[PDB]
Amino acid sequence: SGAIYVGNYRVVNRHLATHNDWANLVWEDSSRDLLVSSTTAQGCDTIARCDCQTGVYYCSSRRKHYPVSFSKPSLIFVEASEYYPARYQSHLMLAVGHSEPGDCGGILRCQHGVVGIVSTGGNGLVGFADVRDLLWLDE
Ligand SMILES: C[C@H](C(=O)N1CCC[C@H](C(N)=O)C1)c1cncc(F)c1
Ligand SMILES: [Zn+2]
């Protein structure tokens, strides 16, 4: 679990969104596993606007942060689950690192700010849904 709080927005994995998230829906994209809902309290996370491929992510299953090199956002195959059929997930970045069910939502950050959130894993890999292209989060 986990979320990004920026301005009057909350960014979460679409498959983990709550009833409150859907009742205050701003935008969602099943192909990216992202949902953005509106908030009453002001968020103070900063979003990165860059092409970094190195950063640090929070891994809940280890209660630790790990440094990673990660790929450029791209269309990557994701296996079937109770939330989605087998499909290509867009804007996804892979890294070699530990992740297991429960880790979705952990933030990936670089020196510029928040890059994205854990969305996939398995096999000594971890996948992050990028948010750097969502320029409207800042306004
Ligand atoms: C199996 C699971 C996963 O990648 N999912 C399930 C939940 C929906 C995900 C999606 N983006 O469609 C795909 C997982 C395995 N290891 C680490 C994780 F953080 C997660
Ligand atoms: Zn950066």
Swiss-Prot record:
Active site: H15 (for protease 2a activity), D33 (for protease 2a activity), C104 (for protease 2a activity)
Residues binding Zn(2+) 1: C50, C52, C110, H112
Chemical reaction(s) catalysed: Selective cleavage of Tyr-|-Gly bond in the picornavirus polyprotein
Domain of life: Viruses
Coiled coil regions, renumbered to chain: none
Function as written in the Swiss-Prot or TrEMBL entry: Cysteine protease that cleaves viral polyprotein and specific host proteins. It is responsible for the autocatalytic cleavage between the P1 and P2 regions, which is the first cleavage occurring in the polyprotein. Also cleaves the host translation initiation factor EIF4G1, in order to shut down the capped cellular mRNA translation. Inhibits the host nucleus-cytoplasm protein and RNA trafficking by cleaving host members of the nuclear pores. Counteracts stress granule formation probably by antagonizing its assembly or promoting its dissassembly.
Subunit comment: Homodimer.
Protein name as it appears in the record: Protease 2A
Source species: Coxsackievirus A16 (strain G-10)
